[PDB]
Design an enzyme around this catalytic site. Structure first.
Site, PDB file in Angstrom:
ATOM      1  N   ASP A 458       1.076  -1.235  -0.039  1.00  0.00           N
ATOM      2  CA  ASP A 458       0.114   0.155  -0.092  1.00  0.00           C
ATOM      3  C   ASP A 458       0.879   1.176   0.090  1.00  0.00           C
ATOM      4  O   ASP A 458       1.865   1.311   0.347  1.00  0.00           O
ATOM      5  CB  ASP A 458      -0.927  -0.130   1.177  1.00  0.00           C
ATOM      6  CG  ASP A 458      -1.501   1.507   1.525  1.00  0.00           C
ATOM      7  OD1 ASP A 458      -2.348   2.004   0.561  1.00  0.00           O
ATOM      8  OD2 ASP A 458      -1.334   1.714   2.477  1.00  0.00           O
ATOM      9  N   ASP A 665       0.025   0.290   6.587  1.00  0.00           N
ATOM     10  CA  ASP A 665      -0.297   1.393   7.752  1.00  0.00           C
ATOM     11  C   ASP A 665      -1.218   2.588   7.615  1.00  0.00           C
ATOM     12  O   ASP A 665      -0.732   3.457   6.583  1.00  0.00           O
ATOM     13  CB  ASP A 665       1.045   1.893   8.373  1.00  0.00           C
ATOM     14  CG  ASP A 665       1.560   0.627   9.137  1.00  0.00           C
ATOM     15  OD1 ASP A 665       1.101  -0.183   9.958  1.00  0.00           O
ATOM     16  OD2 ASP A 665       2.881   0.565   9.029  1.00  0.00           O
ATOM     17  N   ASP A 669      -6.342   1.830   5.934  1.00  0.00           N
ATOM     18  CA  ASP A 669      -5.873   0.530   5.594  1.00  0.00           C
ATOM     19  C   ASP A 669      -6.093  -0.742   6.710  1.00  0.00           C
ATOM     20  O   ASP A 669      -5.908  -1.757   6.548  1.00  0.00           O
ATOM     21  CB  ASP A 669      -4.286   0.740   5.687  1.00  0.00           C
ATOM     22  CG  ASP A 669      -4.041   1.560   4.473  1.00  0.00           C
ATOM     23  OD1 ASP A 669      -4.412   1.657   3.353  1.00  0.00           O
ATOM     24  OD2 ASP A 669      -3.069   2.517   4.866  1.00  0.00           O
TER      25      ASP A 669
END
Length: 779
Positions: A458, A665, A669
């Site tokens: 991510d 994080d 998320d």
């Protein structure tokens, strides 16, 4: 620790202390509940911080005394007492080992060594009476200390355990140690009963076995202790320094003084000079000061503390004068919050331990019954003399050999790889994780992470950095770069917003690249507040119009072919750019790129060769994510996908049976981590990382991931070996000294020898499960 500070008064149990404090409490205000203190041991009245606390209550307790001398109270509650308690545990087991060794070692020595060279062996043979010698008597006497005194734990382990049943280690230990000595008592009773009786006895077995088991227990507990305080680094940012900046009614100044955490309650203001350690969790009121900290991340965070900013306790000021007021108590202190994690480090539950205990319920009764069958076999065989009797060892007949091979099984019983190895390995793994900066909050995560060959990633500080860095100035018309920095700073000096702050970050960047202050900074003229297309400004006498091509058309600035060229260049990689027009003529662009977490070349392009497949599903727009994928490795990419999409895709991928993990994080998320099998967090900026998570890392560098996963797999290497070793050494050597087989082919093995046969398979197991200690990260 308690919120009712446990203060013992001055005067060695002097009641007038309590009477004076009672009078003061009736006089002073702020107490939640004024209650009895003679019944209690200290000031046990109800109160709480902020409204009261260290400062006011210390002042009141002091002033309770007759002036000017005071009942000097600072604080008295356990500061850090786990070390002392665990050290006492170590000392207790050390003392048990010390006593158990001193009596045991001679006992083994007597009937093992002395007959070899025996000027004294005849003294042992010097009969006290009709076959009861000095050596036998002394060995028998030096046996009650072993099982009847020291080993009572085993009994109290078994006492209730066998009271209803289902068994455990305690059962087999107890039976094996008890049988040998108890039958040895009977054999020596029958020895003294006659004068034509034959010797041989077994005391060394019990002593040796108890000593070795106790040694194993000692190693297990000391390893637990060592890894427990291996958290060390985490909570040792404990500040005792402090200041009191007493202010007037308008908060100008009265007096600055150096104090300690003695009086630090809320609404206490501290001046932090450079170098000085920050007091316990303060917040800046006024003052701009560069300060660096590293608490929930390992790659450090430098912040220019503005008038109002979280200056975390136990950190280092770089430069500046700031007023720091205490506004946090308890858990909001990051030290305390992550101590709830070292407390959570004490919280774990191995899932493999389930299978271990399931095995433990199949082993013990079966081995006891199998041992029992041996005695019946030899007994029925000897009673009805249906086999030859000429290899029976001398000075013996039926009742010796039958019960001898009967006892020769409950001493060869192997299990020490079902009671010691697994807890020790699981704990040492967590210890190493803490050593490298990992908080494995549960053996469940460690077991689960073993079999994964694909992970999720991510943006937003997991594969990126913070606000993007300006990377490309094309300089259409020649203006020196440092001059551009000065002009940009002068233009940006009004209407500071994070993108304009990033322009100033580029300014600063190129300044350290060049080095040294240049020309002059001019505040913006004709300034128009509009970040929708760029602001209008005049710096150094030059009409600095920072803004995109729309602004260049808005303020009538010439357009060159390089404008379209850089537009194409921007569309190539989707930088996000802006044009800088000096003197109403475009002088280069100001292209900005968001840097990734820049170790992917070593990390993600190579862990995949180690056997994972990178799945990159993330929130950023399609162009940005596809460019990020175009940079380095990573296969299938799913861009423009909100956290929801991460949730569903991970759900189906885990359902397919690959146990895919996620690395990311952020509050948004978080559901992806929750729904996924295991999580993995580089840096703990988001609070949910401190919340439900699996492989929380101290640092934010993703290299840790490698060091993480291999380690887990490596752990499940050694464990499996032990489960082989037993299922090796256990049943191909147990039937050797288990009777039933021997009426065809001879050669002996004596019952005492199995005592030092279980011994070898009761320490080497611990050695194998402890060699996990020596370990290194691969790359």
């Amino acid at each position: 620790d308690v919120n009712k500070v446990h203060l013992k008064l001055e005067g060695v149990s002097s009641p007038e202390d309590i009477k004076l404090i009672q009078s003061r409490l009736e006089s002073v205000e702020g107490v939640n509940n004024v209650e009895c203190d003679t019944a209690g041991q200290t000031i046990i009245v109800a109160y709480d911080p902020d409204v009261t606390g260290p400062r006011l209550l210390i002042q009141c307790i002091q002033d309770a005394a007759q002036p000017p001398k005071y009942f000097n109270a600072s604080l008295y509650s356990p500061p850090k007492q786990r070390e002392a308690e665990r050290h006492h545990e170590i000392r207790n087991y050390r003392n048990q080992f010390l006593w158990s060794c001193l009596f045991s070692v001679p006992v083994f020595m007597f009937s093992m060594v002395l007959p070899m060279i025996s000027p004294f062996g005849d003294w042992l043979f010097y009969k006290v009476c009709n076959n009861m010698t000095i050596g036998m008597l002394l060995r028998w006497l030096l046996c009650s200390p072993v099982q009847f005194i020291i080993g009572w734990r085993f009994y109290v382990g078994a006492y209730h355990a066998l009271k209803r049943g289902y068994s455990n280690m305690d059962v087999l230990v107890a039976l094996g140690t008890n049988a040998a000595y108890f039958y040895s008592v009977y054999i020596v009773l029958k020895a003294l009963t006659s004068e034509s009786f034959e010797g041989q006895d077994f005391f060394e077995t019990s002593a040796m076995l108890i000593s070795f088991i106790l040694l194993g227990k000692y190693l297990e507990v000391v390893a637990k202790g060592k890894t427990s305080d291996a958290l060390s680094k985490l909570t040792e940012l404990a500040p005792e320094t402090a200041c009191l900046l007493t202010l007037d009614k308008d908060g100008n100044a009265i007096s600055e003084t150096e104090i300690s955490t003695q009086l630090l309650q809320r609404n206490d203001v501290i001046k932090i000079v450079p170098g000085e350690k920050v007091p316990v969790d303060g917040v800046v009121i006024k003052g701009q000061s560069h300060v660096n900290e590293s608490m929930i991340t390992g790659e450090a965070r430098p912040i220019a503390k503005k008038p109002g900013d979280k200056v975390i306790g136990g950190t280092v000021n770089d430069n500046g004068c700031i007023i720091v007021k205490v506004t946090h108590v308890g858990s909001e202190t990051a030290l305390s919050q992550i101590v709830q994690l070292v407390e959570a480090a004490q919280l774990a539950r191995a899932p493999v331990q389930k299978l271990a205990d399931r095995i433990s319920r199949f082993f013990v009764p079966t081995v006891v019954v199998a041992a029992f069958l041996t005695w019946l076999g030899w007994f029925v065989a000897g009673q009805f003399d249906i086999y030859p009797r000429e290899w029976i060892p001398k000075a013996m007949d039926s009742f010796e050999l039958a019960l001898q091979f009967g006892i020769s099984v409950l001493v060869v019983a192997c299990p020490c790889a079902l009671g010691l190895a697994t807890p020790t390995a699981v704990m040492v793994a967590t210890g190493k994780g803490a050593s490298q900066g990992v908080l494995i909050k549960g053996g469940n995560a460690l077991e689960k992470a073993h079999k994964v060959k694909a992970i999720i990633f991510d943006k937003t500080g997991t594969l990126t950095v913070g606000k993007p860095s300006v990377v490309q100035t094309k300089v259409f018309s020649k203006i020196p770069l440092l001059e551009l920095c000065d002009l940009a700073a002068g233009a940006e000096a009004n209407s500071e917003h994070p993108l304009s702050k990033a322009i100033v970050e580029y300014t600063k960047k190129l300044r350290e690249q060049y080095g040294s202050h240049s020309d002059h900074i001019m505040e913006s003229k004709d300034f128009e507040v509009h970040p929708g297309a760029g602001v209008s400004a005049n710096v150094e006498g030059k009409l600095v119009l920072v803004g995109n091509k729309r602004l260049m058309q808005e303020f009538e600035v010439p357009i060159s072919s390089e404008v379209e060229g850089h537009m194409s260049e921007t569309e190539e990689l989707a930088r996000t750019c802006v044009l800088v027009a000096i003197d109403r003529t475009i002088c280069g662009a100001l292209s900005v790129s968001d840097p990734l977490k820049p170790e992917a070349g070593r990390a993600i392009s190579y862990l995949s060769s180690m056997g994972i497949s990178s799945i990159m599903v993330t929130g950023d727009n399609w162009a940005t994510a596809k460019s990020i994928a175009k940079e380095v490795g990573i296969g299938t990419v799913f861009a423009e996908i909100d956290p929801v999409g991460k949730a569903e895709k991970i759900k189906d991928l885990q359902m397919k049976g690959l146990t895919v993990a996620m690395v990311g994080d952020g509050i948004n998320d978080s559901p992806a981590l929750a729904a996924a099998d295991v999580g993995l967090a580089i840096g703990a900026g988001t609070d949910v990382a401190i919340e439900a998570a699996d492989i929380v890392l101290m640092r934010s560098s993703l290299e840790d991931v490698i060091t993480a996963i291999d380690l887990s797999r490596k752990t499940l290497s050694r464990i499996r070996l032990n489960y082989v070793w037993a299922l090796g050494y256990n049943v191909l050597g147990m039937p050797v000294a288990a009777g039933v087989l021997f009426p065809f082919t001879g050669i002996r093995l004596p019952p005492w020898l199995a005592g030092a046969c279980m011994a070898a398979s009761s320490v080497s197991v611990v050695c194998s499960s402890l060699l996990l200690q020596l370990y290194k990260k691969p790359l």
